[PDB]
Amino acid sequence: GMADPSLHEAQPLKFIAVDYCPESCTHSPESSTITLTFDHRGGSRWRSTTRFQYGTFSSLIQCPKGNTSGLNFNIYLSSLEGDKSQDAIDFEFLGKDKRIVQTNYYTAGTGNREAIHDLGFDCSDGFHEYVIKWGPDLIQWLIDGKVIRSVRADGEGFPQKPMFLYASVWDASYIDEGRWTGPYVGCDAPYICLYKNVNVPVGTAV
């Protein structure tokens, strides 16, 4: 009993696109780091250049410092951002409180499956690991190696369309009178959200 016998499959996300405002996204593939910045310019959004059909997705993430009230930073899967009938699976940080994270998923445009989780840490205090495990009848969310939520196919729809990996930072303060992410204060810009060692499924790109 010397070798670790534990079964251990993922590949680094090498190729990404930026959907708007590329000046507020940086990619350093040589250090496996992507950053997103929120400031006057209005944020940005990156994504994988390919869709995937199921698999495990992960990133180290360090959220922005300072007063992030109003902001939404995230990492998520979506069949197509902006599609009214999208399938999706979310990690969304709510800027009013950097010690929580919200999970959610969408089936043919329908969400309303929010859950709020206590992180046990400040998400801007160093890099932490966020994982989405997406299967045909089981979705799991992991944080620093621990499952924080599991949902199984319950007959009320399930994400099954091929999906892009996405990440953005945006001002969500207009949602629910600012009660969701807080009012936007925005006096600590640039708000820099960092993604490191983003990994995608080995063999499910479609």
Ligand SMILES: OC[C@H]1O[C@@H](O[C@@H]2[C@@H](O)[C@H](O[C@H]3[C@H](O)[C@@H](O)[C@H](O[C@H]4[C@H](O)[C@@H](O)[C@@H](O)O[C@@H]4CO)O[C@@H]3CO)O[C@H](CO)[C@H]2O)[C@H](O)[C@@H](O)[C@@H]1O
């Ligand atoms: O131009 C006026 C106004 O524009 C602002 O920038 C907006 C920006 O707010 C918007 O953010 C998207 C974001 O890119 C996207 O990732 C996010 O996706 C959601 C998804 O819709 C949900 O279903 C769920 O899965 O969770 C995801 C992650 O939160 O949705 C937001 C909101 O639509 O993107 C648009 C471009 O498409 C962009 O114009 C800008 O900040 C302001 O300064 C400006 O006034």
